[PDB]
Design a protein around this ligand. Structure first.
Ligand SMILES: *[C@@H]1O[C@H](CO)[C@@H](O[C@@H]2O[C@H](CO)[C@@H](O[C@H]3O[C@H](CO[C@H]4O[C@H](CO)[C@@H](O)[C@H](O)[C@@H]4O[C@@H]4O[C@H](CO)[C@@H](O[C@@H]5O[C@H](CO)[C@H](O)[C@H](O)[C@H]5O)[C@H](O)[C@H]4NC(C)=O)[C@@H](O)[C@H](O[C@H]4O[C@H](CO)[C@@H](O)[C@H](O)[C@@H]4O[C@@H]4O[C@H](CO)[C@@H](O)[C@H](O)[C@H]4NC(C)=O)[C@@H]3O)[C@H](O)[C@H]2NC(C)=O)[C@H](O)[C@H]1NC(C)=O
Ligand SMILES: *[C@@H]1O[C@H](CO)[C@@H](O[C@@H]2O[C@H](CO)[C@@H](O[C@H]3O[C@H](CO[C@H]4O[C@H](CO)[C@@H](O)[C@H](O)[C@@H]4O[C@@H]4O[C@H](CO)[C@@H](O[C@@H]5O[C@H](CO)[C@H](O)[C@H](O)[C@H]5O)[C@H](O)[C@H]4NC(C)=O)[C@@H](O)[C@H](O[C@H]4O[C@H](CO)[C@@H](O)[C@H](O)[C@@H]4O[C@@H]4O[C@H](CO)[C@@H](O)[C@H](O)[C@H]4NC(C)=O)[C@@H]3O)[C@H](O)[C@H]2NC(C)=O)[C@H](O)[C@H]1NC(C)=O
Ligand SMILES: [Zn+2]
Ligand SMILES: [Zn+2]
Ligand SMILES: [Zn+2]
Ligand SMILES: [Zn+2]
Ligand SMILES: [Zn+2]
Ligand SMILES: [Zn+2]
Lengths: 209, 209
């Protein structure tokens, strides 16, 4: 074994928001010193493209260097399932290394988003859990955040998506707030980004009552 | 590199129910043919024990054999944090291989278990999601199942435990049932096994209203 290549997708939020810039990232590790230069070729559905920015080669505390090539991806292209290929070439190895990536494939399914208020019993306490159920979505790439009366409520945690029995995915997000805010009647909103939603975004709000 | 050892815990439910028999499992892989015999020593907190059942050595479709040693563990011992050691000895390697395992460590915290009924909107549908929140537990080993009017309802899925902001864990379980059963008023119960509960078991029931 010589050098290795790893091809990384963009982050899901970058793919879902037009104002962001998704990019895909090809990385080669275990490049030697004696035969140490390397060329990256990039293709989008088999046709070569030339706008990748490759980063200053850089040495590891082990015997190797590493070099990253970053390719900007169009919102459309990525969500339309275009395939991205990184070809890496070295004298140090027999044939160039070939990696491909695209968005998770499969018919898309829109999430159903449901907010659930605290249980009776939890209203014995100093804090309460506000719950967002997101289910029936496909593919599993998704983002969830909470907001109130405008601003983001950063005391929440979200489970990973769980494959459901029908082949779609669900998850839950749990927002914790002082029981006061809840009874003061404040408005909390669970907001969800996923490719199959209209404009890849939806929100559901929750309020005492 | 020669042979490798892997030491596996019991299953959480086996540890939590007295009627079950938890056992821990030591496995050696990449045993050679030329120097191929092996001895297992087992210790519970540093003192040797002699009741492990070691299995018929067995050959791999690659160049190696594999041999498993299984040690029965007492309910108490495992939940009281006793440490289990598998020592594996071979001529094929310099010194014997040493592996230790015990229950996840850390002060235990009892789960709070809360059932949440369907959202308004979900009651537009042919099916409804019944929700069990389990939170504040430690360590993360846990089991959840649903039952109704006696029997187990096997159309449910449970998220993995998620580390929460206070260092405890939570999860959600989602049971789906025909909207009818729900309105027919049936009784559904979320049941939870975890070491910090009284008798390692608790249940919470859910019913229309
Ligand atoms: C000398 O030292 C070097 C260290 O400098 C050694 O290099 C390391 O070698 C390993 C050899 O395996 C490398 O591979 C492992 O790593 C990847 C995952 O790496 C990421 O995460 C780790 C942190 O855990 C980081 O160290 C890396 O930097 C990576 O971080 C991500 O970087 C990305 C690039 O920037 C980020 O993506 C971008 O993020 C941007 C954010 O600013 C932006 O969002 C962009 O849009 C986005 O593109 C990403 O965010 C970073 N994430 C984090 C959290 O930081 C791992 O995938 C490799 O595993 C796969 O391969 C093995 C091969 O058999 C599998 O067994 C393994 O399970 C796994 O998956 C398998 O692979 C195939 C596909 O190849 C699957 O189809 C299989 O199904 C699957 N197997 C199974 C069972 O399912 C691997 O674990 C390691 O990354 C190297 N380190 C670095 C820094 O590169 C070198 O080895 C040393 N040499 C010697 C001789 O010892
Ligand atoms: C020749 O062929 C053989 C195949 O026959 C090759 O052997 C394989 O070699 C691998 C070398 O790594 C082995 O290790 C991997 O496997 C374990 C996990 O194995 C389990 O799961 C897989 C399925 O994915 C099965 O194949 C195994 O059988 C194991 O299944 C479990 O068996 C247990 C024993 O029965 C079960 O437990 C019992 O279950 C009972 C149920 O009846 C009962 O409940 C008992 O109570 C209970 O005890 C269990 O249920 C079975 N589960 C399932 C789902 O079936 C894996 O852990 C190894 O990974 C660790 O080690 C590497 C080392 O670096 C890590 O990088 C890796 O991440 C991982 O964790 C790391 O390790 C350390 C601790 O060592 C951690 O502290 C680190 O932090 C951690 N790393 C990180 C990043 O966090 C590894 O993946 C593989 O198991 C072998 N197969 C078999 C069958 O043994 C052999 O290699 C070949 N030879 C050559 C030369 O090629
Ligand atoms: Zn070019
Ligand atoms: Zn639309
Ligand atoms: Zn779009
Ligand atoms: Zn003995
Ligand atoms: Zn008690
Ligand atoms: Zn007990």
């Amino acid at each position: 074994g010589g050098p290795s290549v790893f091809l990384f997708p963009p982050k899901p939020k970058d793919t879902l928001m037009i104002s962001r810039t998704p990019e895909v990232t090809c990385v080669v590790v275990d490049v030697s010193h004696e035969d140490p230069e390397v060329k990256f070729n990039w293709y989008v559905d088999g046709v070569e493209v030339h706008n990748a920015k490759t980063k200053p080669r850089e040495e590891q505390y082990n015997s190797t260097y590493r070099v990253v090539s970053v390719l900007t991806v169009l919102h459309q292209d990525w969500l339309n399932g275009k395939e991205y290929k990184c070809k890496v070439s070295n004298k140090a190895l027999p044939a160039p290394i070939e990696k491909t990536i695209s968005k998770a494939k499969g018919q898309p399914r829109e999430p159903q988003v449901y907010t659930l208020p605290p249980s009776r019993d939890e209203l014995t306490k100093n804090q309460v859990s506000l719950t967002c159920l997101v289910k029936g979505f496909y593919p599993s790439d998704i983002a969830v955040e909470w907001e109130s009366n405008g601003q983001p409520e950063n005391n929440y945690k979200t489970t990973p998506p769980v494959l459901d029995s029908d082949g779609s995915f669900f998850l839950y997000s749990k927002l914790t707030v002082d029981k006061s805010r809840w009874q003061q009647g404040n408005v909390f909103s669970c907001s969800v980004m996923h490719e199959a939603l209209h404009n890849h975004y939806t929100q559901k709000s929750l309020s005492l009552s």
